[PDB]
Structure formats: structure tokens, C-alpha cells
């Protein structure tokens, strides 16, 4: 399933037999690289306890045979795989879900003229900050503190400047365009 940065999101799991709900010992995990398992929180007989690290970012609640892991507000770190382990007595089941967080792309265009050897070469810059897969290309990678990815491409234009000029930025299926039309001079 998929959700945007900051938004509330809910991953789900359930017990096959519809008769049982509270009886199930549910426990959620955040899958770091190497299929590592970090305990998020546990639930049993409607007694919930989230590990302090995830307290306030994650919560668990139930309805019938269904178990919900609620991310209060998604940030980039959360993108990845999550695992739900449900146990009844000796029997236990593992169900897996993949949460994709997305940051709406931010395309930005800005230009500058060369300062040497002359002032004839105008270089325009197209910059897209998105997640998880930003992409910029002119028509004919840095990591931010928020955890997103910024990428930019530059284009040089010798006089006469063949304007207008267009750059395509996109984030997987998301897409947007930028066009430099005219200089000051």
C-alpha cells in the first residue's frame, strides 16, 4: 500500500478463522535491511503496548478478526517492509506488507550567465526534490535531512539563446514540467 509524507496510514493483518480476535497474540515489526526485525508493539486481549522508540509514531488497535497497525504520520524512514506475527497457542502465522511512503516532487528552475570568458553562455538549472525516485532530464544525487532525494541537471546555451527551453521532472508515475522562456536581457 501507498501513502504521502505526513499522512495517517494503516497497514492491516487478520486471523484466518473469523471466530477469534482478542485471543490472538499480535506483534508488529519494522523490517530493516537484511530482513532484520525491530519490535514496534504488541497486543493481546485488547491490551496494547508500543515500544517507547515508536511510541507516538505507531499505534495498534483491533476490530473483530482484523488487526491494524496505524502510522500516525509517515516519514521517509518508515518506507519499507513491515511484518505481523499472530500467535495462538503453539500455532503462529506471519503476514507481510510493504508500505511505500511518497514525497510529492518539487521541481525548481533557475538560471545564471557565465562570468568567464564572457557573458554569452546562459546555463539554466532544473532541480527536482522527491521520493523515492526523482528524475530530471532536459528536452531537445544528494540526500536531504528530511530523508528525501534531490537531483539536478544543468544545460548550457551559447548565444543566440535558443529559448524557450523545457525540462521534464518526474517521480516514478508523478510528473511535472519546467520551461525557461526569457532572460532579463
Amino acid at each position: 500500500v501507498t501513502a504521502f509524507l505526513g499522512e495517517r496510514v494503516t497497514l492491516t493483518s487478520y486471523w484466518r478463522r473469523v471466530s477469534l480476535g482478542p485471543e490472538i497474540e499480535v506483534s508488529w515489526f519494522k523490517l530493516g535491511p537484511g530482513e532484520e526485525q525491530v519490535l514496534i508493539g504488541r497486543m493481546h486481549h485488547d491490551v496494547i503496548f508500543i515500544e517507547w522508540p515508536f511510541r507516538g509514531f505507531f499505534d495498534i488497535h483491533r476490530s473483530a478478526n482484523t488487526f491494524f497497525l496505524v502510522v500516525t504520520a509517515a516519514n521517509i524512514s518508515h518506507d519499507g517492509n513491515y511484518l505481523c506475527r499472530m500467535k495462538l497457542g503453539e500455532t503462529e502465522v506471519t503476514k507481510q506488507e510493504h508500505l511505500s511512503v511518497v514525497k510529492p516532487l518539487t521541481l525548481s528552475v533557475h538560471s545564471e550567465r557565465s562570468q568567464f570568458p564572457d557573458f554569452s553562455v546562459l546555463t539554466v538549472t532544473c532541480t527536482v526534490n522527491a521520493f523515492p525516485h526523482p528524475h530530471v532530464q532536459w528536452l531537445m544525487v544528494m540526500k536531504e535531512k528530511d530523508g528525501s532525494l534531490s537531483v539536478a541537471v544543468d544545460l548550457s546555451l551559447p548565444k543566440p539563446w535558443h529559448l524557450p527551453v523545457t525540462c521534464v521532472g518526474k517521480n516514478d508515475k508523478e510528473e511535472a514540467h519546467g520551461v525557461y522562456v526569457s532572460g532579463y536581457l
Binding site: W15, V18, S19, L20, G21, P22, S63, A64, N65
Partner: protein
């Protein structure tokens, strides 16, 4: 005096059939009912329960029109209306006292109703004036 025989086994049977026909699930619903922890006296317990059962029947037990269970619920509602004359008024202070919120399976709720009608039936047969009793004390204890 007719209160002695107002409740018939036809009603308890239709009620039990209704119960058995329900699918067993985990999902829990919320409803107000008598707290046993604060009110243990059988007579006063049932006395208090009666009105809560009226409300639950009215607003909770919903079935598709003209279904056997829908008609069952109709019969039971009528029965409740006739039973109104067998319970005496106590006080308005106590309404919403001795009452808690329950989060349980529909089956458990219907079981509570069944127990009510059954025990109410028995006590009425023993003494049709049993529910004239003053329960202000039993209620105030809560």
C-alpha cells in the same frame, strides 16, 4: 394478575432460534447494560434490566423487513409493551445508575436478553407481584 403468564415459551423459543441463526464472529459492539458488580439483587437487577432491554430491542436488534427474526423482534417488542404494566416506577434519579458500557459480541448481548426473559418469566410465575418491590436502596448502593 395476567402478568403471571404474559411471557410464553413460544417467545423464548423464537428468541433462541434467533440466537442460533446468528453467525459467530469476533467483532464487538457497544451497548449500555446492568453492571452486576454494583447490583446483585436478582429482583432489582431484573427490574432495572427491563427498561434497558426495551431500548436495546428497539434500536439494536434490526433485521430485514418481514424476515422471521424481524417478526420475532416485533413479538418481543409487543411483549415488552404489555409487560410495562407489571413493573412499578421507582425513581428517575437512578436511571443511568448501576449502568455501564459493554463492548461484547452480539451473541453475548442476545444471551443477556435471553437470561432476562427466562428469569423474569420464572419469577413472575412464582409471584406475579414480585416486581412491585421497592429497589431504591439496591439502586442507591451503586
Amino acid at each position: 394478575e395476567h402478568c403471571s403468564h404474559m411471557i410464553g415459551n413460544g417467545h423464548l423459543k423464537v428468541l433462541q432460534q434467533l440466537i442460533d441463526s446468528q453467525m459467530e464472529t469476533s467483532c464487538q459492539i457497544a451497548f449500555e447494560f446492568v453492571d452486576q458488580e454494583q447490583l446483585d439483587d436478582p429482583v432489582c437487577y431484573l427490574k432495572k434490566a427491563f427498561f434497558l432491554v426495551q431500548d436495546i430491542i428497539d434500536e439494536t436488534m434490526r433485521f430485514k423487513d418481514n424476515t422471521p427474526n424481524a417478526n420475532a423482534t416485533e413479538r418481543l417488542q409487543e411483549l415488552s409493551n404489555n409487560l410495562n404494566s407489571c413493573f412499578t416506577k421507582d425513581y428517575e434519579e437512578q436511571n443511568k445508575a448501576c449502568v455501564r458500557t459493554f463492548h461484547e459480541t452480539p451473541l453475548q448481548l442476545l444471551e443477556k436478553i435471553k437470561n432476562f426473559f427466562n428469569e423474569t418469566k420464572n419469577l413472575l410465575e412464582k409471584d406475579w407481584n414480585i416486581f412491585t418491590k421497592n429497589c431504591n436502596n439496591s439502586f442507591a448502593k451503586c
